[PDB]
């Protein structure tokens, strides 16, 4: 009867009929061109005077290893 319980049952019902977006989901997929849906991005800042300011600690940093060249493990193991 609670609000969260109804939403959880809706999501469990939507767990079935999932995968590559068949049926009604083909039309419902076009809601992203109709109501400005925000995608799964991480926000890097905030507007103060309408000019966006990217906070430098929220800029993306990738900890790549020192050398991936002549490293002795490949993505494939011999049979």
């Amino acid at each position: 009867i609670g609000r969260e319980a109804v939403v959880d049952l809706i999501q469990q019902s939507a767990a079935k009929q999932s995968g590559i977006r068949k049926g009604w989901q083909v039309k419902a997929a076009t809601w992203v061109k109709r109501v400005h849906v925000d995608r799964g991005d991480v926000k890097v800042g905030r507007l103060e005077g309408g000019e966006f300011q990217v906070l430098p600690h929220l800029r993306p940093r990738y900890f790549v290893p020192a050398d991936l060249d002549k490293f002795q493990l490949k993505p494939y193991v011999e049979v």
Binding site: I1, R3, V6, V7, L9, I10, S13, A14, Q17, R21, G23, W24, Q25, A28, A29, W31, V32, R34, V35, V37
Partner: protein
């Protein structure tokens, strides 16, 4: 006056009337959603997407 064109489309009004949150805002809307679930409808509300 010609009839038949009562449906004037609007996304704001469609989501604000038959969306998930107005259904969840009231108890009888929540039993409407519950019997939509018990019937087995693939689309629960007019604004559901993934």
């Amino acid at each position: 006056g010609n009839r038949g064109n009562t449906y004037q489309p609007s996304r704001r009004k469609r989501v604000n009337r038959h969306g998930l949150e107005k259904r969840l805002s009231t108890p009888q809307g929540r039993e409407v959603l519950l019997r939509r679930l018990r019937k087995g409808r693939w689309r629960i509300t007019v604004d559901s997407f993934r």
